[PDB]
JSON list of C-alpha atoms and ligand atoms in Angstrom, two decimals:
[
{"chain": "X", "resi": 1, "resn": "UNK", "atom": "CA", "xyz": [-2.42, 33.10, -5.90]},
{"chain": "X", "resi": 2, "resn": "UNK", "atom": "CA", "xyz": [-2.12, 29.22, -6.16]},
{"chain": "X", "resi": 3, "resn": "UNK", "atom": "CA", "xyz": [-4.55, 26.96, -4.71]},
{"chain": "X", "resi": 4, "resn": "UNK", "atom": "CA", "xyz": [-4.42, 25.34, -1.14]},
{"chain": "X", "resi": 5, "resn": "UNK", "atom": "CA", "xyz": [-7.56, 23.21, -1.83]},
{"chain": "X", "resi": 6, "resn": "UNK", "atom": "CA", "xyz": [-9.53, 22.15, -4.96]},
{"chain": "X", "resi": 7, "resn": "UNK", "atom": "CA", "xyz": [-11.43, 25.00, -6.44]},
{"chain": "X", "resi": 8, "resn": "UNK", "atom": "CA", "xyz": [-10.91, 28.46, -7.42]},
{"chain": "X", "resi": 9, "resn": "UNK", "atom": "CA", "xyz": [-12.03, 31.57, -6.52]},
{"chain": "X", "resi": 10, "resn": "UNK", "atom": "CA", "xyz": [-15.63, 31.34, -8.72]},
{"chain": "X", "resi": 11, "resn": "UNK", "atom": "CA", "xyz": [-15.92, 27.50, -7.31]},
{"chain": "X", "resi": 12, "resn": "UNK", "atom": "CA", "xyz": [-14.55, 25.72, -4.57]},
{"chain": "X", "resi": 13, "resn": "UNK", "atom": "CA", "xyz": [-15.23, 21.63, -3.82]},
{"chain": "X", "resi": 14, "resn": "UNK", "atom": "CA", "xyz": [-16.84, 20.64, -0.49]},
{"chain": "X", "resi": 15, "resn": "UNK", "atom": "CA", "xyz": [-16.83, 17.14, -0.04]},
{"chain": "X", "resi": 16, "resn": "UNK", "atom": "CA", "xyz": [-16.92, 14.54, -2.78]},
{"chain": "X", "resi": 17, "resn": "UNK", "atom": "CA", "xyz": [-17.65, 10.49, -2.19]},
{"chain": "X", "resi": 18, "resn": "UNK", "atom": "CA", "xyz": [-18.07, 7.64, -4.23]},
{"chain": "X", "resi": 19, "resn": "UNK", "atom": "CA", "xyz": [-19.59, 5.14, -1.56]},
{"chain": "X", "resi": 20, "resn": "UNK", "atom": "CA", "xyz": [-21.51, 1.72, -1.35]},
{"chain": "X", "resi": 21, "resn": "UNK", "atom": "CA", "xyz": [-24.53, 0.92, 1.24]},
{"chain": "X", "resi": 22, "resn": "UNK", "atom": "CA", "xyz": [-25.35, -2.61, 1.40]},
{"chain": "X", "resi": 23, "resn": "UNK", "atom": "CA", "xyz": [-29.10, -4.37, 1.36]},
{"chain": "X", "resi": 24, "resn": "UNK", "atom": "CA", "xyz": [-29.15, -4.60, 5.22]},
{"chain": "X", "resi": 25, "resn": "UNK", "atom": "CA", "xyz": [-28.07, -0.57, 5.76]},
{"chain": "X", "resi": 26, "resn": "UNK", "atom": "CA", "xyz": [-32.16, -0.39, 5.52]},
{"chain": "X", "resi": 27, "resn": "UNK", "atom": "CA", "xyz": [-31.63, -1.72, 9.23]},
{"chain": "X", "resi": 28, "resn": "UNK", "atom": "CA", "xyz": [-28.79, -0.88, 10.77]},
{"chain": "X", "resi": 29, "resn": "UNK", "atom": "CA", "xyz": [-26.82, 2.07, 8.38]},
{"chain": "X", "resi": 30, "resn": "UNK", "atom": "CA", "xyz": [-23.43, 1.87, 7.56]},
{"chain": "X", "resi": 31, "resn": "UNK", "atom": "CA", "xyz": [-21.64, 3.42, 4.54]},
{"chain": "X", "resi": 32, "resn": "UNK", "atom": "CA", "xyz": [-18.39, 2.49, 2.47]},
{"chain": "X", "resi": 33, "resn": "UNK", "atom": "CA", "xyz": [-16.28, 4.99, 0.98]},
{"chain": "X", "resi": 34, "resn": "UNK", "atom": "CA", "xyz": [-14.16, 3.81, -1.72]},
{"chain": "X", "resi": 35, "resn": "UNK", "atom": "CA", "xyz": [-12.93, 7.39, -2.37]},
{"chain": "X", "resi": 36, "resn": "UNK", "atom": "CA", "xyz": [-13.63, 10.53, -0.24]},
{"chain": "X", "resi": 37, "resn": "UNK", "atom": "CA", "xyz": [-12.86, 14.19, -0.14]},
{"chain": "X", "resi": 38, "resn": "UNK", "atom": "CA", "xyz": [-13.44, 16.75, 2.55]},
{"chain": "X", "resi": 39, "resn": "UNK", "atom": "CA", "xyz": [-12.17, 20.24, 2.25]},
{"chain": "X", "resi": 40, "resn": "UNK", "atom": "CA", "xyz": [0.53, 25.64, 1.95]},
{"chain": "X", "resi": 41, "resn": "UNK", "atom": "CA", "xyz": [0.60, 25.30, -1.47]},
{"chain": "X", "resi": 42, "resn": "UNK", "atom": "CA", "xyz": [-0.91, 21.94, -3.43]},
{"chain": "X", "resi": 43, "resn": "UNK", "atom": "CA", "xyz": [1.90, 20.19, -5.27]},
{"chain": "X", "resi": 44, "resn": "UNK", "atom": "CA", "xyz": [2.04, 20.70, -9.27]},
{"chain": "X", "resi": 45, "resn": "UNK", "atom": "CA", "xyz": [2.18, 18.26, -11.96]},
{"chain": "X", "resi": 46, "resn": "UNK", "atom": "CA", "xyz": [2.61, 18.72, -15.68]},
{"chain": "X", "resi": 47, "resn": "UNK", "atom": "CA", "xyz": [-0.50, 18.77, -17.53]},
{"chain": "X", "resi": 48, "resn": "UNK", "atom": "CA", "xyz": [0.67, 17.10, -20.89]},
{"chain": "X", "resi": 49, "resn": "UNK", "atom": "CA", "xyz": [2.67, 14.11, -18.78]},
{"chain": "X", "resi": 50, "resn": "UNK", "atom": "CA", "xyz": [-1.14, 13.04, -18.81]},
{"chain": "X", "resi": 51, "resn": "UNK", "atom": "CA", "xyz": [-2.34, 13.45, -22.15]},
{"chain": "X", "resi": 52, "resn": "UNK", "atom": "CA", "xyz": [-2.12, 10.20, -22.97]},
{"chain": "X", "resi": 53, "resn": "UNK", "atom": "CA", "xyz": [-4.64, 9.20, -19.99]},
{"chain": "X", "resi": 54, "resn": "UNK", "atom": "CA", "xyz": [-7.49, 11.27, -21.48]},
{"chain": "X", "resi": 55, "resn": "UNK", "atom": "CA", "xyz": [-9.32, 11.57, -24.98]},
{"chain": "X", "resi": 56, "resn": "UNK", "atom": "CA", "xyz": [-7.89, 14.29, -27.23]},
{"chain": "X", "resi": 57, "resn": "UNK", "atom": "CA", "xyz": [-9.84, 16.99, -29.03]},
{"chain": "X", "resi": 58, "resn": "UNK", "atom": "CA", "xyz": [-12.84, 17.45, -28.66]},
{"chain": "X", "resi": 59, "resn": "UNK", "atom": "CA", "xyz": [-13.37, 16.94, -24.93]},
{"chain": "X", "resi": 60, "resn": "UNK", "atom": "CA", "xyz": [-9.36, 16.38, -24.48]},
{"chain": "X", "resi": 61, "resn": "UNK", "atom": "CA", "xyz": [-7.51, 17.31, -21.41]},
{"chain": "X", "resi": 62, "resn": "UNK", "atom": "CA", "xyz": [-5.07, 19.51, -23.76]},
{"chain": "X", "resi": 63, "resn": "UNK", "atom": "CA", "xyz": [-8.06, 21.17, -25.83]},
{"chain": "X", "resi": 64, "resn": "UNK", "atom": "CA", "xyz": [-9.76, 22.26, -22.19]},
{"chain": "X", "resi": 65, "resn": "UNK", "atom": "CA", "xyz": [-6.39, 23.33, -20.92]},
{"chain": "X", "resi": 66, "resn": "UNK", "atom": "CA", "xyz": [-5.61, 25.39, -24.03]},
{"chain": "X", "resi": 67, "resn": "UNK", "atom": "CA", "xyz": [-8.73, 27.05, -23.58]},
{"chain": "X", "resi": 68, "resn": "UNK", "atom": "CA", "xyz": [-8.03, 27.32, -19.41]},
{"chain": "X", "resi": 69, "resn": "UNK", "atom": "CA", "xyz": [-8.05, 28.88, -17.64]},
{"chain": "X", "resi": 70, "resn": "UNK", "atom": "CA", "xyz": [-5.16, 27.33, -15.96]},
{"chain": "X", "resi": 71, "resn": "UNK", "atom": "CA", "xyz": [-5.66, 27.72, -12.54]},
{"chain": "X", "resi": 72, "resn": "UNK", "atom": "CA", "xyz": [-9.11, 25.07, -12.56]},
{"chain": "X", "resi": 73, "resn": "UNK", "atom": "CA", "xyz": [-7.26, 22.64, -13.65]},
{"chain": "X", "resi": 74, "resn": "UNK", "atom": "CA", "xyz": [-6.70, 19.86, -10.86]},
{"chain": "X", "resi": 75, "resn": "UNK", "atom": "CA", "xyz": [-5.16, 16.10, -10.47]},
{"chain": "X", "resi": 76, "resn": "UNK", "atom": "CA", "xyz": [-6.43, 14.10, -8.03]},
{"chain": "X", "resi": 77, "resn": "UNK", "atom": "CA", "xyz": [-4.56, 10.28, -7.21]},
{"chain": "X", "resi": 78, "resn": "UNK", "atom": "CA", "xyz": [-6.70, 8.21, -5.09]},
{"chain": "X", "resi": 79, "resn": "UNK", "atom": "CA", "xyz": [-5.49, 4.88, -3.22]},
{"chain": "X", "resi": 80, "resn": "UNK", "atom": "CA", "xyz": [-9.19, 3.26, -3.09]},
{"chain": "X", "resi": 81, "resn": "UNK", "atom": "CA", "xyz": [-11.13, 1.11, -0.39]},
{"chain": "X", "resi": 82, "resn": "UNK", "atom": "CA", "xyz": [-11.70, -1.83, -2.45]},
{"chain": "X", "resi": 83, "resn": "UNK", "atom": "CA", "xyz": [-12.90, -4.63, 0.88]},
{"chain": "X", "resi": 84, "resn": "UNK", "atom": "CA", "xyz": [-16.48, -4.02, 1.31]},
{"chain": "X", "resi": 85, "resn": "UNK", "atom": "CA", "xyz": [-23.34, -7.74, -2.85]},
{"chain": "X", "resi": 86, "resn": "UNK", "atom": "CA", "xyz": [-26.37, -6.13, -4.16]},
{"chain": "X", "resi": 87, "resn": "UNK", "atom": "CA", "xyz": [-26.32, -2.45, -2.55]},
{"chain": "X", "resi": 88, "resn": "UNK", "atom": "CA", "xyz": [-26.65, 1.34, -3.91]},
{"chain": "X", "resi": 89, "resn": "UNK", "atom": "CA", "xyz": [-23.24, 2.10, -5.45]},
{"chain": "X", "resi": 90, "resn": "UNK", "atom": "CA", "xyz": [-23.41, 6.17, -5.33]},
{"chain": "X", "resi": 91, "resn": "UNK", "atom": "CA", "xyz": [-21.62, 9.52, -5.79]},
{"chain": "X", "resi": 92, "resn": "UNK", "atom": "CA", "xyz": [-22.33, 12.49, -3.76]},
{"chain": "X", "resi": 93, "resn": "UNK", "atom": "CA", "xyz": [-20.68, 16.24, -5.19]},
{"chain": "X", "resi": 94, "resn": "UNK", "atom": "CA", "xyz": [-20.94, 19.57, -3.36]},
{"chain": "X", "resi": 95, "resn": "UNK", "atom": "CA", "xyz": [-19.61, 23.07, -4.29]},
{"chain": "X", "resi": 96, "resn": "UNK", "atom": "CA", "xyz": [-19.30, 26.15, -3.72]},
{"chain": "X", "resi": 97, "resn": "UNK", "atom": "CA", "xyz": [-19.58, 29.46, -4.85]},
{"chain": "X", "resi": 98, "resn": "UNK", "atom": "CA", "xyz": [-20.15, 33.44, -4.22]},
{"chain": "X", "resi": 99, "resn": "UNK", "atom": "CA", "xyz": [-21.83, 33.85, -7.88]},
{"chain": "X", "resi": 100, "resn": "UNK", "atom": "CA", "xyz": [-25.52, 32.35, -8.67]},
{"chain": "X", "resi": 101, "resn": "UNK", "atom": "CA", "xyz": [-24.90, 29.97, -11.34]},
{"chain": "X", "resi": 102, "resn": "UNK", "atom": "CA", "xyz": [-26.20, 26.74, -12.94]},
{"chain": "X", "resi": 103, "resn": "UNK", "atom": "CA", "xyz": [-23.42, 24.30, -13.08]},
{"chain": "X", "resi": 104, "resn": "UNK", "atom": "CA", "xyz": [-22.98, 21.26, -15.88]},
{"chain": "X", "resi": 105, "resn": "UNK", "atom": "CA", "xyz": [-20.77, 18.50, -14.04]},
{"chain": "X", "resi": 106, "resn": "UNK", "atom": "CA", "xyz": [-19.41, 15.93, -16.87]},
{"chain": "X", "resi": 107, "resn": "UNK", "atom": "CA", "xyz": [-17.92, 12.88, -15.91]},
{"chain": "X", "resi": 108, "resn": "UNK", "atom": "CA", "xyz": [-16.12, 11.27, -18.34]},
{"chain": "X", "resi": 109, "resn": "UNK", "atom": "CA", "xyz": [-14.80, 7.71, -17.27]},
{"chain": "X", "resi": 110, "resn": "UNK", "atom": "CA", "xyz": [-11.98, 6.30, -19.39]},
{"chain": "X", "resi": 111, "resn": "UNK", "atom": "CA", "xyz": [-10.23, 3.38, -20.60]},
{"chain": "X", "resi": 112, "resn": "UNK", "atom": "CA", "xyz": [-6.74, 3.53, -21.89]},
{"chain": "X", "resi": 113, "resn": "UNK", "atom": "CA", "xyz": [-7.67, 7.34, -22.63]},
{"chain": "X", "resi": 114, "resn": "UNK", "atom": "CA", "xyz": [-10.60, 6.46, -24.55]},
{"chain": "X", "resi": 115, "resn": "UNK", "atom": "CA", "xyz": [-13.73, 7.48, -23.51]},
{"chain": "X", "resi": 116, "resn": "UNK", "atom": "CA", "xyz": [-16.03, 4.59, -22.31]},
{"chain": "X", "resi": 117, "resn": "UNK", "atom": "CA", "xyz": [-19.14, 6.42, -19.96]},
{"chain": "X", "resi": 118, "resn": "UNK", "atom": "CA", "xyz": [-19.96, 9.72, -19.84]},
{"chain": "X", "resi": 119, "resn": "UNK", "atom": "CA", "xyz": [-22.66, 11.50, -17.15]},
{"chain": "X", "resi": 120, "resn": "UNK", "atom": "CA", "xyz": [-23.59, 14.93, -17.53]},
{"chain": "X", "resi": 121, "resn": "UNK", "atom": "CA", "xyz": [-25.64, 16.31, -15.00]},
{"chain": "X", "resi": 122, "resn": "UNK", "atom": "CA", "xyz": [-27.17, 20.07, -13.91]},
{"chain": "X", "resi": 123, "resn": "UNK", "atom": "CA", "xyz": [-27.65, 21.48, -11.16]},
{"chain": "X", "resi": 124, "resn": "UNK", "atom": "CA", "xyz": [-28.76, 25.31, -9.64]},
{"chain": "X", "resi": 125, "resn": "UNK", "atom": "CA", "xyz": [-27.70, 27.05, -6.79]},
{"chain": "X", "resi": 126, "resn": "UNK", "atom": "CA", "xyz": [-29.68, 27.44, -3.59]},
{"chain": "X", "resi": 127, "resn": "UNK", "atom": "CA", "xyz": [-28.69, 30.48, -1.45]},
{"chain": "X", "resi": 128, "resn": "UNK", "atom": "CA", "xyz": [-27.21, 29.79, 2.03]},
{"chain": "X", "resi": 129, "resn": "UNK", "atom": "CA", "xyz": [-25.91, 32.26, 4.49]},
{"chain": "X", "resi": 130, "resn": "UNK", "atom": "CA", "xyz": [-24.33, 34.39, 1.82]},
{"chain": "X", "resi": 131, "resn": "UNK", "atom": "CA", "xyz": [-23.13, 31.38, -0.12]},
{"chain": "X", "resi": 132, "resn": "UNK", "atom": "CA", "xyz": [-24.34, 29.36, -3.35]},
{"chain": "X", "resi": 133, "resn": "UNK", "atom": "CA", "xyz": [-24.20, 25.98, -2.21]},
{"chain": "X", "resi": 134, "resn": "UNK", "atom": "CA", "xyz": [-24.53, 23.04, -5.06]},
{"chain": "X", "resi": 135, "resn": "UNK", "atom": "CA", "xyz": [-26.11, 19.62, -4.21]},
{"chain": "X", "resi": 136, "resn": "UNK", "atom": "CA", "xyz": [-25.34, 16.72, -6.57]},
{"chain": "X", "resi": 137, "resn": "UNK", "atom": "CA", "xyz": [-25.53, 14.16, -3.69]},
{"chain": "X", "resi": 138, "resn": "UNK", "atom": "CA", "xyz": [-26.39, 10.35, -4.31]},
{"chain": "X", "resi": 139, "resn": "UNK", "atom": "CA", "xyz": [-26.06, 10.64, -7.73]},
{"chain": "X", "resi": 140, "resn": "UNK", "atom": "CA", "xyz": [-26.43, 6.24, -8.72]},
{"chain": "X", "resi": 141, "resn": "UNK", "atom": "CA", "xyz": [-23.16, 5.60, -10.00]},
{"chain": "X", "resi": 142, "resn": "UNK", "atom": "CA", "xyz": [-23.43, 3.70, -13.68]},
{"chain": "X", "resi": 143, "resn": "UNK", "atom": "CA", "xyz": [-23.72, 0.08, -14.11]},
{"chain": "X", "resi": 144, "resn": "UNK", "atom": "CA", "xyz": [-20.26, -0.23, -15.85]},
{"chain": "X", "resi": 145, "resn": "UNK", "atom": "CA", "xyz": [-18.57, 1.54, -12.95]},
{"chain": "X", "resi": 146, "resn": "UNK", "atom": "CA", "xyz": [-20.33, -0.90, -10.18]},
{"chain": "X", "resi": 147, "resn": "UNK", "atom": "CA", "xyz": [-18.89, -4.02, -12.68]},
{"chain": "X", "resi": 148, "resn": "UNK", "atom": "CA", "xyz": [-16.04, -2.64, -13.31]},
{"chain": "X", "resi": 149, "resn": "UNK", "atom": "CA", "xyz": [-15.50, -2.25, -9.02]},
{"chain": "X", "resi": 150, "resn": "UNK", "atom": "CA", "xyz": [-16.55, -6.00, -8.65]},
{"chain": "X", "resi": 151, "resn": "UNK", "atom": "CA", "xyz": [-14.15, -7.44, -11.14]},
{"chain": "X", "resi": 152, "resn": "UNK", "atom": "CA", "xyz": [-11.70, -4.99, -9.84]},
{"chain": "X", "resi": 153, "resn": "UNK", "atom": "CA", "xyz": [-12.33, -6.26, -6.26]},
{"chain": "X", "resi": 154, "resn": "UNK", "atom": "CA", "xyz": [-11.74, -10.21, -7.13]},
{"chain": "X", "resi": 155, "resn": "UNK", "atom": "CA", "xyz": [-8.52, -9.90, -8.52]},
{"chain": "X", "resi": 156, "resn": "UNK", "atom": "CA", "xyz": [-6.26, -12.45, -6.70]},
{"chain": "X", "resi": 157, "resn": "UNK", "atom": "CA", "xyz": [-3.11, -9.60, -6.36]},
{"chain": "X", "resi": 158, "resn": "UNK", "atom": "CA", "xyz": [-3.49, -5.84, -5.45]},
{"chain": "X", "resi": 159, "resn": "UNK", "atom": "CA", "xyz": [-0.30, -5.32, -7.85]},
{"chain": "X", "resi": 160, "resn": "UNK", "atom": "CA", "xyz": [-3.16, -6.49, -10.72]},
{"chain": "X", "resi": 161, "resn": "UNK", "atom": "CA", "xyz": [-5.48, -4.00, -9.02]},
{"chain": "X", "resi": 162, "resn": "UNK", "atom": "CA", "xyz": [-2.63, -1.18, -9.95]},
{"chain": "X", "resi": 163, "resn": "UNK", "atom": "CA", "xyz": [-2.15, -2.74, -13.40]},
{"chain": "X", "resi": 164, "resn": "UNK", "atom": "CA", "xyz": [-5.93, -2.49, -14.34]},
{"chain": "X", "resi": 165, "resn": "UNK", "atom": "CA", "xyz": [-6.60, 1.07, -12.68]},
{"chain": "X", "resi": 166, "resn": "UNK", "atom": "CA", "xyz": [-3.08, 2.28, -14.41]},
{"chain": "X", "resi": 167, "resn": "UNK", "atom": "CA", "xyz": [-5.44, 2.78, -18.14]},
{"chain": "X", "resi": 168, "resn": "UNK", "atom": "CA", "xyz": [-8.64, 3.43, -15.61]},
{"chain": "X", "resi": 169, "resn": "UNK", "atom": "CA", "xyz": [-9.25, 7.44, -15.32]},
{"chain": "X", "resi": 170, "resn": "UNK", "atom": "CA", "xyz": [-12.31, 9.80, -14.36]},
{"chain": "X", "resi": 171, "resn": "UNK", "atom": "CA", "xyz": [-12.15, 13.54, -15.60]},
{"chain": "X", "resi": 172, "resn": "UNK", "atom": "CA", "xyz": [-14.43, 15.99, -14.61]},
{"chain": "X", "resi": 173, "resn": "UNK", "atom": "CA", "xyz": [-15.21, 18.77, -16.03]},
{"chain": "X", "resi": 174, "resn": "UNK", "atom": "CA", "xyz": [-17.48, 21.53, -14.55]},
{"chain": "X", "resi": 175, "resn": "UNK", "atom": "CA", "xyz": [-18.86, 24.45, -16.79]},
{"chain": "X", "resi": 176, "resn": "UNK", "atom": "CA", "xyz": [-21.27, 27.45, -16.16]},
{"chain": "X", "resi": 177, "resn": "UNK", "atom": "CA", "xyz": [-24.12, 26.07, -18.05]},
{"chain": "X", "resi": 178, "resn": "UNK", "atom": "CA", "xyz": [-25.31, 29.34, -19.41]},
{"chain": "X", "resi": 179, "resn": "UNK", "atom": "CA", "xyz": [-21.74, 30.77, -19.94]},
{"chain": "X", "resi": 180, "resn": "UNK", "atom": "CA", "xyz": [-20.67, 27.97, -21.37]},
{"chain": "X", "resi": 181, "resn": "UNK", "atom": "CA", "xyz": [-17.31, 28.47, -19.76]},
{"chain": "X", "resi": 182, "resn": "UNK", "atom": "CA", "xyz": [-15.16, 26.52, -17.87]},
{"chain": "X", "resi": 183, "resn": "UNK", "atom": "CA", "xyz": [-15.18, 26.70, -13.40]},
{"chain": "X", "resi": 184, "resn": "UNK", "atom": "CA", "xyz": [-13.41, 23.01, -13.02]},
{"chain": "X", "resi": 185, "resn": "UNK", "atom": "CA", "xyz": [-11.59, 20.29, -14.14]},
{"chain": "X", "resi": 186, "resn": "UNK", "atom": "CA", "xyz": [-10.54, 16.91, -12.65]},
{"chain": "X", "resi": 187, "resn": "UNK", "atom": "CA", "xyz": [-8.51, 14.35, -13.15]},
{"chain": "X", "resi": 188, "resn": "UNK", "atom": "CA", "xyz": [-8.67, 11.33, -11.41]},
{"chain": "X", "resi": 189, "resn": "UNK", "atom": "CA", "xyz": [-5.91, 8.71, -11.52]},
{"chain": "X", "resi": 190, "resn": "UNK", "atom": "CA", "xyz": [-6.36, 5.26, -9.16]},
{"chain": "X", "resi": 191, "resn": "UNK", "atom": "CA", "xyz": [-4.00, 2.67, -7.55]},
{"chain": "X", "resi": 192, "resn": "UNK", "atom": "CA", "xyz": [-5.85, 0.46, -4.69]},
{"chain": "X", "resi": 193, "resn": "UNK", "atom": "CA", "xyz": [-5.43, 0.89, -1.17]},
{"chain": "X", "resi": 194, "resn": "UNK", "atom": "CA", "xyz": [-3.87, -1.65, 1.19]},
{"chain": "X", "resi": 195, "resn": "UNK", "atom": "CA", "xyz": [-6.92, -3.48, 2.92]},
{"chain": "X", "resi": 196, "resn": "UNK", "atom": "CA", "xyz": [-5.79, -2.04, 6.39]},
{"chain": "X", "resi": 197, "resn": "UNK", "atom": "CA", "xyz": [-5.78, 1.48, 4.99]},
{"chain": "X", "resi": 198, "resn": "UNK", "atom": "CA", "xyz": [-8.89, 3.38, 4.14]},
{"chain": "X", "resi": 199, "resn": "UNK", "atom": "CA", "xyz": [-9.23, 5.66, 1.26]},
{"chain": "X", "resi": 200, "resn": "UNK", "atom": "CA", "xyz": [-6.89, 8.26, 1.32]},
{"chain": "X", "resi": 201, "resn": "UNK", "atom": "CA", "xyz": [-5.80, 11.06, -1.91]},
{"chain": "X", "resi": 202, "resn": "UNK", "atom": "CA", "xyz": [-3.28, 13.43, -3.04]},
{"chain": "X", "resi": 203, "resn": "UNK", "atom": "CA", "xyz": [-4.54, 16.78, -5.09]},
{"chain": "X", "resi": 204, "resn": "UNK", "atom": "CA", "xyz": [-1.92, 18.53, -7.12]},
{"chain": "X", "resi": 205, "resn": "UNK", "atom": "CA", "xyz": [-2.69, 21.43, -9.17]},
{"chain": "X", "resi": 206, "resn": "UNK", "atom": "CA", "xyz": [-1.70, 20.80, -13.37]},
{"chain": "X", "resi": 207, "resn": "UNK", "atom": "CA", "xyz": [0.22, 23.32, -14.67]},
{"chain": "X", "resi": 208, "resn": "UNK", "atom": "CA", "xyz": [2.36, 23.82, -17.68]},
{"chain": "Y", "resi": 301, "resn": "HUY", "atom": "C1", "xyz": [-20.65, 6.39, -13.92]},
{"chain": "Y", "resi": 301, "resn": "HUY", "atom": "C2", "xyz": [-20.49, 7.90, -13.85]},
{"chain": "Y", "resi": 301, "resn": "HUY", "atom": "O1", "xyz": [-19.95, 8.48, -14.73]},
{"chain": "Y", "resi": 301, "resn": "HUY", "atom": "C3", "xyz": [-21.05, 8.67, -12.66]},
{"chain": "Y", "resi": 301, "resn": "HUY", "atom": "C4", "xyz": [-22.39, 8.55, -12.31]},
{"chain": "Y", "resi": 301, "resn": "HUY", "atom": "C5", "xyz": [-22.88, 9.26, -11.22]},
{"chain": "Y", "resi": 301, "resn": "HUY", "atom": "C6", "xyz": [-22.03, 10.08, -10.49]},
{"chain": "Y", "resi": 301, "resn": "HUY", "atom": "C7", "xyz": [-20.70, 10.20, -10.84]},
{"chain": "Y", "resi": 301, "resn": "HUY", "atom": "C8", "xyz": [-20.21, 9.48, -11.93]},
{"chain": "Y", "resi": 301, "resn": "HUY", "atom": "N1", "xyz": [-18.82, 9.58, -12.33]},
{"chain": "Y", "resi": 301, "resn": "HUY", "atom": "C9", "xyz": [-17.73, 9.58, -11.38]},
{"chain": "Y", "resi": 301, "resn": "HUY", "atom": "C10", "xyz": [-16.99, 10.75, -11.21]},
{"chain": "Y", "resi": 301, "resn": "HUY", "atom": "C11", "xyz": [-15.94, 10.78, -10.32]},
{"chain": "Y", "resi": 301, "resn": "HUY", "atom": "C12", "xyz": [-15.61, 9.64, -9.61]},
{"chain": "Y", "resi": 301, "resn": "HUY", "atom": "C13", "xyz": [-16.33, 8.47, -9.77]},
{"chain": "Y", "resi": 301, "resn": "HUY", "atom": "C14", "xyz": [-15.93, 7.24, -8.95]},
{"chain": "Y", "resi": 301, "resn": "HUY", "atom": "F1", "xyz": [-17.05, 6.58, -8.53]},
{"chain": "Y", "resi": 301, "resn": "HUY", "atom": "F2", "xyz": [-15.19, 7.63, -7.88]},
{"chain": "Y", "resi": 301, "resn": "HUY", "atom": "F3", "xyz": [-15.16, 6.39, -9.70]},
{"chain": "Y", "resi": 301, "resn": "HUY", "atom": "C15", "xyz": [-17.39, 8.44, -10.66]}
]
């Protein structure tokens, strides 16, 4: 009964992309992904080895985990594309499910465990062959994430790159908006890819 992908039974992840278009993809259309998923056991990692990279209670990794349930409780590492000046800096998010529900996707990015941006966004099913499918696709990523990518992306050493993104963390958290209870939660650590190497990540599921 442990997961092989991201998701649960109730709600499974599709794909998920935080990407960059430049001016000139008007004309010919190209797309950078700094991070990307597309979707045996997963690995496991221990959940409180990570407090210290998210806020505490309320809307603390240890407060959602106490109230579970366990199983939606996910890390994700990501070694980001960070070679790619004035484009659309987007994130595209698609689920699934077998229930009709309205999901609430928070994204909470962090500094040094401290909460710096949060987005909180809804979204309703739409019925497709037999499945609920939910669209949050080319949702414009926040003006402190696009700074924060070009400082990130001038540093002179990738080993500062690490350094930087070792107090930089994303966690989101997906609820049944009329429920009120939780479907999903994500945690999102980053080091930087090596400029030859695209994006590539590494889910584990947190347990305790
Ligand atoms: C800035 C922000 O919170 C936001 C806006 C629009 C869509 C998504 C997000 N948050 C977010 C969540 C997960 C990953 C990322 C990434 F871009 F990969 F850093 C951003």
């Amino acid at each position: 009964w442990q997961a092989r992908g991201l998701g649960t039974a109730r709600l499974q992840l599709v794909e998920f992309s935080a990407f960059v278009e430049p001016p000139d993809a008007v004309d010919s259309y190209q797309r950078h992904l700094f991070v990307h998923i597309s979707q045996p056991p997963l690995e496991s990692v221990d959940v409180r080895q990570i407090y210290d990279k998210f806020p505490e209670k309320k809307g603390g990794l240890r407060e959602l985990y106490d109230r579970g349930p366990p199983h939606a409780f996910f890390l994700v590492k990501f070694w980001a594309d960070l070679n790619w000046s004035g484009g659309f800096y987007g994130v595209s998010s698609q689920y699934e499910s077998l229930e009709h529900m309205t999901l609430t996707c928070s994204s909470k990015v962090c500094s040094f465990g401290k909460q710096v941006v949060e987005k909180v966004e809804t979204e309703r099913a739409q019925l497709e062959d037999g499945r609920f499918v939910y669209r949050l696709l080319r949702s414009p990523m926040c003006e402190y994430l696009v700074n924060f990518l070009h400082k990130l992306r001038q540093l002179p050493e990738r080993y500062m790159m690490n350094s930087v993104l070792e107090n930089f963390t994303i966690l989101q958290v997906v609820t049944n908006r009329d429920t009120q209870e939780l479907l999903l939660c994500t945690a999102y650590v980053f080091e930087v890819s090596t400029s030859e190497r695209g994006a590539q990540h590494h889910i584990y599921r947190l347990v305790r």
